[model samples]
Target: EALVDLCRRRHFLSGTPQQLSTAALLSGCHARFGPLGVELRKNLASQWWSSMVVFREQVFAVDSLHQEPGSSQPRDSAFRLVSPESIREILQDSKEQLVAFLENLLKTSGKLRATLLHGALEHYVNCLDLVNRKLPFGLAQIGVCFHPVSTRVGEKTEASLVWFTPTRTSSQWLDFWLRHRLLWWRKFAMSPSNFSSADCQDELGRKGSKLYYSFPWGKEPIETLWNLGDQELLHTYPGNVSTIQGRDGRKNVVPCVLSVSGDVDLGTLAYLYDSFQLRKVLKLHPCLAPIKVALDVGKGPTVELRQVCQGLLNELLENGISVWPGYSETVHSSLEQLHSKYDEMSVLFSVLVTETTLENGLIQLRSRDTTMKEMMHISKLRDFLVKYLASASNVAAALDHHHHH
Candidate 1:
């Protein structure tokens, strides 16, 4: 608790010099990339690399290892350690290498040089470290759910998720979402992903377990947010991010799950977007304001038909289970017959979250629309997504928000 207070006081997440340095370090890495985050990686790289050298001559002074004449060479034995002087020679070689590498990288274009110096390099470095654990899990079987027969044991089991993230919407919102679903999945699967601890067995008869799940969303954090134009979200498959490296160093990667029928949707997407610790992971594109609207208007919707494709009207009575703010009396007459069916909101699941979107549903990009009227229009769209998630029996955590930095 004290640590959190100190961190908050220090403005750690606000990008202090110390924090930026650490962020760049953590961002650069080599293993299977985890979260492709936001922030101007190339810009940051330029600043970091440029600041390191006083003049171009210092960089160019470096020469090829063989050209350094009189340079010491280690005996051909691979295992033997080289003399300390050799280490100095290699260090000098690296300086010139950096200049050459940067010149080529920066000159090659598309901000690749900047990305390497800034966040990408750090992310790559960190990922390599994340891979050090001999294996992700002792067990890799699919459908291993983690059902907790007891609440105390179950809550304790989830501490890992809670402990790693801080309190507040920036990080903690998805605690119940991901952890709960995984546990439920373990139970849904007959074999179960056992917690395997003797303490895991509670007064209730089942054992508690925890599992690690990872995927490469993208090369940068912002990429994880959407599919712009023809670009699709990054997955762990193909030549992408997720390559299951075995304990023995063997590896395999596959395609992302994106089938319209079998893929993730509005509800499941909550954890990815709403619960994301935005400032810590990266910045949210202002255009993403639509996400909030889509989330909010979908609250408490019942019928899953296009009949009310994004309902804007409000029912007379307040919905008991699923409810949202911003309804006006005039909405009834304005919306007419469309508002009647929405009287019943989210009933089956408590996890459905109301999206408070700022997306004005493609507002008068070409024309003009009243602020109040346009807001109402977008309100209904949020309902459409909410209704869909409510129908999925196995998906209740779709509505919750979180913060995980």
Candidate 2:
């Protein structure tokens, strides 16, 4: 009950008592996200992309399509057929005829993708033909992968890293990638102490390790990390197909492929839901929060007060900060109500412009976490927020340095 209340109050999802039936119809495996939810998801994906691609020189990102040829399906039941005509025909045909038609369609039609590894491998082969790059590089991709209802129910966005390394150093790369991901999670997760890692028993007959994060409200570990080793790649691309020239100029050598996969959607849910449970308020890192700052003016403000608020809003927007310009004249909420709303949304800072700003350049700067207000010159607010947002990712840099030493 509180989960729904929190999500609704924070503007993550939209529904009301009058539209309960309409909302329920749209609430199966997927969710209908509001503006704030979309912004948060986009921010999370961008952060993952920056961490995996922009920050690392050896990693490259690929924007692969969600649909691929049916022949590229990774497993027998990994894909869903795309054509509506085929669906109609299947429903209208006899069982035996439908079976025959399905067999032919699976060989020819388009299929919704269920994993990113296939496209990554295709790109890797394509790159091998163009670039003379050596091993130890990686192909990172973030996209939605669909799963059949027989296996898993919903569609999920995943961040996958396919790292190619020398066979001798594969284990080291696996350890490094695992540690790197844990640190990345720690940077945004409110309850970092709840995260844990353990070796899998090869239950699926695949050689890999896993990381588990126990959410505050859930008994079972809600998130997982799959450290897939060379087995999957070698199995998929056998013999000469997967081969690359070795360091010593030997031919027909297959470099060990170490891949890491994480469900980004689940990670976002865990962070948001767990933080709400722990703090009784949504507490996201500034970098990951949808709105970094919320700007407001005093109630019944004059033209000059409104102008000051607009000026500051434009400044923050020009500086590329995601800000909400909450004009007091437009919104009917009280100052305390507005503060609580922004706090529930996890906005990092709230800036208030009052009539005093016309006399002096000082304005109120409120911290979201502490709710403490301080006076600052309007000229300094932009630089201060920019610096603070820039420092948000410094933890990743520090973690990288720590790992190196």
Candidate 3:
């Protein structure tokens, strides 16, 4: 009963689903940085924080950006928050803003900017601690180290300038992944279309990658599945509505890009927060291993020299059940002309119709008029491709070993 009489701010930004998520995100930021007067210096530097709802989990960032052949150092996570004072300031800032943001009506971007101008390094350290506890299945913590694009202002987009240093450790990866994963769940379960309009981050941030997930609103099943672009369909097909971009920049957005390492059980969502705390401790940013040793490239399905990419698109329409041909410009040229249908419906044809629809709703306008419907019907067919390749890998191994099973 005898504490500092700080007013308790109960944040509830409930309305539409998108509004709800933004409200929740702000609340989380406030909570993490907000203060409890007790200054238990050493222990408070970083520890497990279960009540904070936004960044609900953590993982180790132990991976290398330098994927060069045989160029690596012994693994010792270089990504660490060596500066403890910054950690304190981040937490303190969160504490103060949590109260201020909750009291405001019609939350503003500048308010959100003030509410969460930064994040806690300690919380990120705690993220690593939680993941290292224990790992589960169907779980993975991946860090986006390099992108061929840039979200930084006034800069050209490319992957070459991505930073790498000798000090990077498994720990730094934790902060990067936690922010991404938390925001991903928020956007996926909430408003995914926010990407098309997200002004500050156009390249690759938590909000940027979500563009891949936001393409499934009110679309035909085929249309939904076809846009998955080298990703799983069921995992990312619901947010494809073209309308979401209009509301962005009008409100406060919490966009993040994450680096994580944890065990996941694909079958359940209840374990998400619980699973966040437990992760596999990997030596991230390790010294480069040989490409052959590290990656299983080109070890998959192949065809005869002439039939190199035979029926590739056909397979993608099917169950995505076959191997891709070797990638060479020669193969691409031959494949472009390999079949008669190639002339009628190639990427070029796709560009005209689909690109036109994306830029302007020539398709939607056409929809309002009768007989115009036949002119544009977008269909996206997906092939479940990964597990099939895994199975193929097994078959190849058994054949080599002459073992039946």
Candidate 4:
């Protein structure tokens, strides 16, 4: 409803295809990022892959299905079981309000999906135990999370990912996750945007949970950490649980399970789209960018300069780097067209293919962020891009190689 209303006010209620397309593009729903509208999911995956798994050896990936407890009543009429003692601890002053809310949930048809989705976290913890995995190692999974119905706010089924890690103490893992998570969100924060961490106390059966990066759109959190209690951990695996030895090789105990969660919804991505100008979105994340370089076939003495860029374009594309040349008809018109079509944001390096550049078999390179220009031979272009556009994980290889050796 808000989006439709926003579209009506921002664009037109009945706009043309291009008009709607441009507006939607402005809202971070464009194809250059990939597929029709999966930029957010890809961007999140790339960022995490680069940060957690690729950069380090300990963390690993897993694929898991959504699991929730069986409810006897209809979904609309279902209610998440709540212990008044837990609610009383968190909502001491508002115990009556919390009690009434739970009562209404039982009286009326409401969604219990948040409870279901939240309940699934225990399964992750149990999986770690079943596999005989050690503490400090984390399992990361991305997939659909469900709620039988939308009862509370933001209660619908959504796509999200979480990294589960076991630590010595709850604070050790929760604080560690929250601190690093803030820095991650800060990187994505751009002009006209502010970012911070939020304390989440309202989640049923959980306390010390925190939300990271809430936008103006609504309370939907971009990232979150749930601080689980011992009872909750026990409830998670009420079976013959496996225990692991400690670093001292003496005592065996259960590991404290914690999680770092993120929602990869297109709407949350739109907040970023709404915050940034087109340029930032284009240069948003190198791994997330669809087209890395837009080669401009500039005005030339004729043929030779065009030949240079064409060769470079083929080489660039063959190496798995996304590159394309601007439309070339004539010199003056082509330069104007290139500037009009592709902005600095769209292309990290805008290569000018012209007489001066053709002389040394080199092209003029201009950076999107710094606007700094340099002249380099075609042979060095591949190495240049590898340094700039490689994913964060690959960028860490230098350190890995030096440190490992």
TM-score of each: 0.18, 0.85, 0.16, 0.64
Give the alpha carbon lDDT tens digit for every residue of 63-155 in model 3. 223222221143322221123454465567556774664333122211111100012221222332343322110112122221111221111
Query: What digit string (tens of lDDT, one per residue) describes model 1 on residues 1-405?
Result: 222122223221233334333223233221111111111122222222232122111111111111111211421111212255544655665588758754543333221111111121113223334545232211010011121221211100011111111112211223232343344323212223321111123354322322322212212111111101101213212364443232323433211111000011111121122222311221122111111121112333333311232243233112212222323222233221222111111111111122323223332100001112323343344354345434432242232222223
Q: After superposition, how far is residue 306 of candidate 2 from its true place, in Å?
A: 1.1
Superposed Cα deviation of residue 350, candidate 1 (Å): 24
Regions of model 2 farther than 4 Å from truth: 14-28, 71-75, 86-99, 106-108, 130-133, 150-153, 203-206, 216-239, 246-252, 277-280, 299-301
The runs of at least 3 residues in candidate 1 whose Cα sits more than 4 Å from the true structure, single-residue gaps closed, are 1-14, 20-210, 215-291, 294-385, 392-405
Candidate numbers, best TM-score first, in rank order: 2, 4, 1, 3
Global fold similarity of model 3 (TM-score): 0.16
Q: What overall lDDT goes with each candidate model?
A: 0.23, 0.71, 0.21, 0.52
Say which prediction, candidate 3 or candidate 4, comes out ahead on lDDT: 4
Best by TM-score: 2
lDDT per residue for candidate 2 within 1-405, as digits (tens), equals 565566776777555744323224122245545678768778888888888888888788777888776673434675656678768766865689878777777687777777788778767765554446466678889888887653444577778888777777767777777777777777777778766676664566545666666744443332344445556665555675535443424433456777678777666656666557334457787778889998888743567787898888889999899888786457678988888778788888998888787778888999988789999999999999999988876754566535631
Could you say which candidate leads in lDDT? Answer: 2
Q: Against the true structure, what is every candidate's RMSD?
A: 24.3, 4.0, 27.3, 10.8
Better of 2 and 4 by lDDT: 2
Clashes of each: 49, 0, 44, 3
